Amino acid sequence: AKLVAFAEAAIIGLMV
Amino acid sequence: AKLVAFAEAAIIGLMV
Amino acid sequence: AKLVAFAEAAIIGLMV
């Protein structure tokens, strides 16, 4: 799956 | 180069 | 905010 990172502090990596 | 990420678990980052 | 990574050596992550 492709991985996307987000900064919200924490980093969240969500998959597609 | 840009790093593109995938997760298959091992995470792989490839250079573009 | 989404993060984008680059490999320049060091890795740089920039917020979008």
User: Within 13 Å of residue C1, how many CA atoms lie on the same side as its CB?
Assistant: 7
Query: What b/e sequence results for A1-16 when a residue is b if at least 16 CB atoms lie within 10 Å of its CB, and e otherwise?
Result: eeeebeeeeeeeeeee
Chain B residues touching A15 at Cβ < 8 A: 7
Task: Enter the resolution in angstroms.
Answer: 1.6
Distances (CA, A) of C3 to B10, B13, B14: 20, 14, 16
Contact yes or no for C11 and B3 at CB 8 A: yes
A9: amino acid identity, one letter:
A
Elucidated via = X-ray
A-B CB pairs within 8 A amount to 12
Can you give the three-state secondary structure of chain A, one letter per residue? Answer: CEEEEEECCCEEEEEC
In whole angstroms, give the CA distance from residue C2 to residue C14.
Answer: 8
